[PDB]
């Protein structure tokens, strides 16, 4: 019984709400698959799978710019090493706790597994709030954290990366301190700058990968980006490069947005327009409204792009940005495909509605994995002690996205259209489960 | 101010009730001391003190006697290394969780400090339930636990020990695996058997220590064990050797008990009586009732010792065994002193009754520290590569207990009698605090 | 001098029968070369070469399904690291002893060297008898063995693999325990499953490699597989994929066989036919005779393929399957080449007969090395942190075989035909010796 | 049963003749005990005990004075770590092989256990022949050996020592290279010189301990060395300091000896004269006009206490008959197995106290234990402090023998020593589980 399993596992963590809801999500989707495949229920596999191999919680003491000694909490959740070394980002945010990091690390496990790359699953962070912190304060905090965390990481053990609160600068400081303490220059972090082992295509990877996956899904169901009206939400890293690769595939990309308005360009984005957009946005001063004003384009103040008739919708802004309400307009306006650049931007109800209406739906769990896949490419390049040209990284990434798509198809059902929600959850589970089964009771 | 600090610290651990209580307890009695000694509030000392240096939570996978794979959670809370290596027992019980281990680890930190030995504070365990398990199952569990835990321990890093559900057998299993995996024979566990580096006086240490401390307490306040009627609860090693030592100080020890009842002997224990009680209790099913019968002694089925008029009460049975009702009886019958052999046998209500009524009260936090002090001595002898005669361990334990008592007195106030709950909390804090301040921000 | 050397070497191991035989064979093979090239005898090279760098013998204690404690003996022979990390299988068989493992490790040093890959030489195992053991018993045994073995192994130190008694299941068990104990996911075992770092092409490798090598040899001597009558003996892993690859080069493969007899198809194997032979031989009762009956082909009960006139003969069944009488027939029928898929299928006398009649002869140590080569490719893919598609592993495998071919030609003399027996023997020794000489007295 | 166990154990090593003998001898002495205490056969205890935890065999390549590259084989048998780190000497001799090193390492386990010190059991060596080698060749060999061995040793792992072919010089070279490679100065070898962590009392250890044990044995049975007449055989290291300590207890030590014969002295040894013996026995004999005997043993002399400190099987049956007729009250073995087994029985049924060498001559190992303890303490002890600790240890070994020596009119120290060594190892193995 699904319910007694969930109840049984929640007993150890009765107040980890985020983690609880995360186990429920995966386990509900896997349950019917499990009952048809006895192999995946032996050796108390589910219990082993939800209990992280190792979590380290530790104290981080540091001195602020007013010379006040500050105390923060940090964690590295080392969830699964079945497929490879623990892998997943570090998050610095005042709301960070173990429930959140476990939910995140649980999900990275299946996501990394899906890339076909030899990567396990982890996540870490601190309740440290970078907001209003000076560069020095951040550097000292990063260093203070690494004086404990360094002993638990390694090139073939645990390789973290960035996340909310932890950008390139923070990755720089942690990696630098790791190298100093360990007297070892191997790849222990990804998201590195190009001057110390970073990879090309890292900025483009998530958005490019989203387009790659979506085109495979469209192609399989007799379609392509070619000449389709595409709406993109967001105007950040993901949106920006999704727009870029969409244009290269011959699509007419007619929107982008920020947290207060949407620009409409039925003529379609161009390279020039996008560059000019990437700019205005890059500062933080700049607004999508100013971009529109600059190019004489219709701007929808306070609105999303979901009322605009499109063939393909790519939510690339944030979670829950596309609900049944928005799903209804898209479906009525003739949408043929929906694919997630952001993490969980589509509500469960909208997702249900989309699948009921025959709309292709590509979940972020597979569709946005370009980022983590390219993190694996960075590790590989570092491993080989040779950097790769942009074109070969992009190509490899493309090949990975096609393999993710293929794995989804294998488990996505016999229906006229693949169920990618089912397909991606099952594919990620099987790779992990198979490894755990093979490596004995440890 | 106090409330504000306790509210602040609880934000990180909203549901760790036992930990919040432990902190509440320590801070409440520390608060007036800190106002008179503000240097111990400097460098955010308190904030640093309540956050453990590191906690390892880890999965433990093992196979039961029915060949079913089982999954348990385990932890090692490495709370403080300010004075020396993390030190404290392992507990196997289904109720074990991070809140409880943190509360226990926090308390071991101050107890070890009090002993004047170079030992830090730690505590670990697992929700594994030893009840009904076969020796094979316990061994396999212990060994599974160590295949992860061994990497986090070390003779100068963290030396664990026994506790509820972790007796000599289990310590032997864990030390065996530690030695095997590490190919290193150094002292990583205390409570070892004599065949592999254990210490003489280990069984007697807590009971002997209780009597040594109590006698020092009595002597300060113009009294002694000599000629005194003493009641003891319990009939395990703590109670047994308390009786043995009290008898040597010329005391008339008139009771002992188990979960089934209390034996009463107004003529007093003798060497030969106690020796027979020890033999009886060492059998699987030996009861106090059997002892009472053998010697024609009064036996109170289902009753505790506390309604007997005595000059000194020594609870050595279990937590919360000495309550309000019991205290009213003891107090009205003219009890002069109460000293704890067990872990927190006296409820807080009953403790307050004793203190307010002018009854000398020695908290287990100080009085039962003979056990942890002797674990320090085990480490000393293992380090020296030469074991000591029983007389040498005993004489050293005696000196330590007198040092503990002296420290409490130093901080116990200037009333008609020393407040040992006050003294013990302050004394343990001061040593740890001094250590933390000198070693900088780490 | 030869006899003097072997007599001297046996003094240290008077009872190691198999090891003495291995040394005798290898040295006999090399003595004429050594006398013409005294540089390879200087610096006490041969004396250093026959003495393994290190041997670990160790106790393995484990518990059987009847809760009875069992004691077995295990070894890892780390014979040579001149060229790279110790590399070689683990064997579990009641007949296993040091003498046998040294013989296997000594030969493996040169076979590995011959691959041109950077692998040293090693071999290991235990007298543990896997027959009649449960999955539980085998897992506990593998785990027990690793609790000692893990400390002597490593990705750049020693990388074992399977052998008799140690298949994919056992390799999975050992690698899992290795990873657990070490907290490190680098490649320490080859033969891994595809879910945790295994390589494609592993089943195909030995047969594929046999054909690649034979084609190189033919091509050097003015010939090719194209349009040639090829006889294959055997019908297992090696024969199957040798037929598969030979068909791709355009050969006419006209036989296959099992211990019961030979199928003869003068029209030649096709893909369709081969898939049916494999499906048939995949069942325990399935016979070559069933394949013959299905396709209406000639079947020779209790006969080998060697009566059939062919251009090329590929013994892929078993040791000594091709003796002088068979050799005479093949020769008189005009055979042009013979290459060994199985382990030593050709008897010494038959080998001489082939060479003396100008028949190209590729020895197994060179010709069947595809398997070992692919273990090198597995190590490489893991090192690169990227798995390769089958097409890429296959091409890389092909390049290795050409390189092995080149190594043999370098030392195969200047006769009208390259002598590959001589060439394979010298080349393996020369590369070990060169590396030993270069690296000084250690 | 005993025969079935021995035959089964041999299956894994059909040609290890010395090892087979060691196992047979240990198990034989234990079997009656084992039959009465089935607890000690449970958990396949014996099967685990006879199979060493690990053995490292390794190649040593070194260069001789003629610039010829030589190849030798070395080993380290890490037999048992149940009670503490592996501990035992290294032996350089061309006869050395795995069988011999296992025999010695197996026996060393129980001898080390019996001292009551926290020491496991091991033994190592090489077929390298030190004979006719220069200091430089020996040094280069020791250093080459350690470039492999260092990684398997450690202060809390395995602490070797000297043995045949491995003296203070070689211990010096090995300990030096160990320190260099590890960049760690902790105690990894015993037998070190006084300038780098060695212990005082080392030369005196075996002979002193012998007297310490025998005096404890005598007192338990209502006697002591004082006023008693003691005979000693030998004039080497043990014999020398045995005389010195027994003199110190008030004994009248009347004899010493070498291969060439035996010297007598009713007036007994004195301090100034023992010192003269050491320097140089017929030569010493001439310098004092003492009674001298050629090619014969000291056992023909009427004595109260006899201390064989010469060689194996030096106290035969008829000599024991001499001693017993002459009124001997206790025999104590200083040398390795100096009394034959029949003489042992004759003494025991004749009511004379008998101290086996594995117990009585244990001062040597005991002092290796003291060296480690001083190093661990980061202190050197004065000779008086070392000697006082040694005495304490010998009383502890004595106590260990008594508790398994039975309840006869006098304790059986042969049985006591054999069992006590076994039981402490077995108890430790039981407690640490299946590993």
TrEMBL record, chains A, B, C:
UniProt cross-references to Gene3D superfamilies, sorted A to Z: Glutamate Dehydrogenase, chain A, domain 3, Leucine Dehydrogenase, chain A, domain 1, NAD(P)-binding Rossmann-like Domain
Residues that bind substrate: 87, 108, 111, 162, 375
Domain of life of the organism encoding this protein: Bacteria
Keyword Repeat: no
Domain Glutamate/phenylalanine/leucine/valine/L-tryptophan dehydrogenase C-terminal: from-to ranges: 199-440
NCBIfam families: PRK09414.1 (NF006929)
Subunit structure: Homohexamer.
Family recorded in the similarity comment: Belongs to the Glu/Leu/Phe/Val dehydrogenases family.
UniProt-recorded name of the protein: Glutamate dehydrogenase
